[PDB]
């Protein structure tokens, strides 16, 4: 039981980390492409998250 709960907590922590990274690298596609969209991740294209 203890190992099972530790595994569940570990996978939940990793999933939360991945969700945070995905939301932090958020982007929105704009058809005109005149300028970068407002809904853009600050650390988008940076070597940090990758």
């Amino acid at each position: 039981t203890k190992a099972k709960e530790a595994i569940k907590s570990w996978v939940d922590a990793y999933n939360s980390l991945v969700d945070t990274f995905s939301s932090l690298t958020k982007y929105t596609a704009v058809e005109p492409g005149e300028e970068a969209s407002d809904k853009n991740g600050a650390l988008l294209g940076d070597s940090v998250v990758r």
């Binding site: 596609a29 492409g33 005149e34 300028e35 294209g45």
Partner: protein, 35 residues
């Protein structure tokens, strides 16, 4: 000249649009390559 500065600025705006379109295409490149 008024027309010279006018069409230079309009070409600058069009170039901004095109360069930002290519930049958004690069961001979509990054997203598809992430997938």
């Amino acid at each position: 000249a008024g027309q010279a500065i006018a069409n230079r600025f309009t070409a600058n705006i069009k170039g901004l649009t095109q360069a930002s379109r290519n930049a958004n295409d690069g961001i979509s490149i990054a997203q598809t390559t992430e997938g």
